[PDB]
């Protein structure tokens, strides 16, 4: 019996960080990062388990079926918060196009959204747990033809067909440039707002610009956080896979290697997925700043 590093999901010592994503104007979604990473970690465990031996290669689409049903179940719990979620969307809709009452509305609905996620903790936890029980069951039943010379074809295959592509996608993008261009945009909006919010007094616009800029700095912070992780994990992953790929290991060492790799991947995938999603929301809110700033013509 192994030492899994994604094990507890009901250890209140570490806060369940919730990410808000507003990719397109008028749409909203959320991710409970602990749950996302957990679920993904056991997705890599399951695949590395069926790919280690050639006899189980074909069973891939049955694992895909399971994972999909598990995901389908998790989405059903997220949709139980749709009321508060939609209540927040229309609030932002009114706020982007009273401001005290408007902001009180935003704060109340946003807090009710998080409170909702707390209400369904047990439901999410069960769905994640069934996935752990599955991945662990498969991984526990992982065997080699010779326990002293275990094959590494499963690790190699899984990495090439599931993880490698994302490493190249990340390397092709200059994420640090994306953050420098985003800081440039935020500094620009602050300059144009402070210079605009000096005298000419029209209530409505000033408040909307200040609000969108606030949101954009929060989204930026999340992008910087994930990009940082993505860089760390890209070097780590690329440098580790090299040593677990073309050789054989003892059963115990092989499982230590697979666990470690699965945990790395999980953190990488999580923050990558979130990075792209928040990138889309940052430029979605930027388009609204361009519109409101352009709409500032006195004719």
């Amino acid at each position: 019996f192994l030492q899994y590093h994604f094990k507890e999901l009901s250890n209140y010592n570490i806060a369940n960080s919730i990410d808000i994503l507003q990719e397109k104007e008028g749409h909203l979604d959320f991710v409970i990062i602990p749950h996302y990473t957990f679920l993904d970690y056991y997705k890599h465990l399951s695949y590395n388990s069926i790919y280690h031996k050639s006899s189980t290669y074909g069973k891939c689409i049955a694992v895909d079926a399971f994972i999909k049903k598990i995901n389908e179940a998790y989405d059903k719990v997220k949709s139980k918060c749709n009321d508060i979620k939609n209540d927040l969307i229309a609030t932002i809709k009114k706020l982007e196009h009273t401001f005290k009452k408007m902001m009180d509305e935003y704060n109340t609905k946003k807090k009710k959204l998080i409170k909702c996620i707390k209400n369904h903790e047990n439901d999410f936890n069960k769905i994640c747990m069934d996935m752990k029980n599955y991945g662990t069951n498969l991984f526990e039943q992982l065997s080699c033809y010779n326990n002293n010379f275990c094959n590494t074809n499963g690790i190699r295959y899984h990495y090439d067909e599931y993880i490698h592509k994302l490493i190249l996608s990340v390397k092709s993008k200059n994420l640090n440039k994306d953050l420098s261009d985003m800081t440039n945009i935020l500094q620009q909006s602050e300059l144009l707002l402070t210079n605009l919010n000096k005298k000419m007094g029209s209530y409505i616009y000033i408040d909307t610009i200040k609000f969108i800029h606030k949101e954009m700095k929060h989204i930026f912070n999340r992008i910087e956080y994930h990009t940082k992780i993505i860089n760390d994990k890209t070097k780590i992953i690329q440098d580790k896979i090299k040593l677990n790929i073309w050789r054989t290991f003892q059963k115990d060492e092989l499982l230590k290697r697979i666990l470690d790799m699965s945990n790395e991947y999980s953190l990488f995938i999580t923050s990558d997925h979130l990075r792209q999603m928040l990138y889309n929301t940052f430029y979605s809110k930027e388009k609204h700043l361009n519109n409101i700033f352009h709409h500032l013509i006195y004719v």
Partner: antibody
Amino acid sequence: QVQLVQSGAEVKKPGASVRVSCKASGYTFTSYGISWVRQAPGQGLEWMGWISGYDGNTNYAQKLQGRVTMTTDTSTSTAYMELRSLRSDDTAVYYCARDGPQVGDFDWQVYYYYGMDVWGQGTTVTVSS
Amino acid sequence: IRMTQSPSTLSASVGDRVTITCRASQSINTWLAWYQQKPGKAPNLLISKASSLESGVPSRFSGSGSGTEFTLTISSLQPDDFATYFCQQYNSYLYTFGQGTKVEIRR
């Protein structure tokens, strides 16, 4: 929001054949299968067969072997079921259910233990002269 | 392959604890699905494998059993629960169903 929508009810004379469609929706039909279970009037549920959306493989019940055919059209993600040479004891309600993609696979199926979760409203088939 | 339930026509009230047994001819390991069907409606999956009742099922249903016999428990009957219940075998692809247990309100 995942659903299976079956074809309209049928009235068929004994000996004729019937095709019952089960059009799936809002899931990845290609990585899932479809079973078929029928319920005579007043009696229980009797399994018919299973057909995958990956392999296009099939497992037909021994009592119906040769008389039943069932294919899959992943372009429209629809599963069909054709029962030929109908007889009076075939009068029943026909149901289709979302199943595992490898049911009667070579070895184990400990990769998807969930039974038949999503189902269809059903299709009443009347075999009477 | 031969599924045989215990009670054919059970009679319980709202709040009662209801237990339905499902015995088999041969050995099944953990593969026994439970289903609920109201007359004139398509069945609904309740539990699969041992006690893994798929999401959206009342957190009062339960399944205990291995080998030839199993049980479906409803800790506290609600008005919606009055329907007929079935068990299914899936150790081998040739699925088989139980005779069904109709749950009636006892007045």
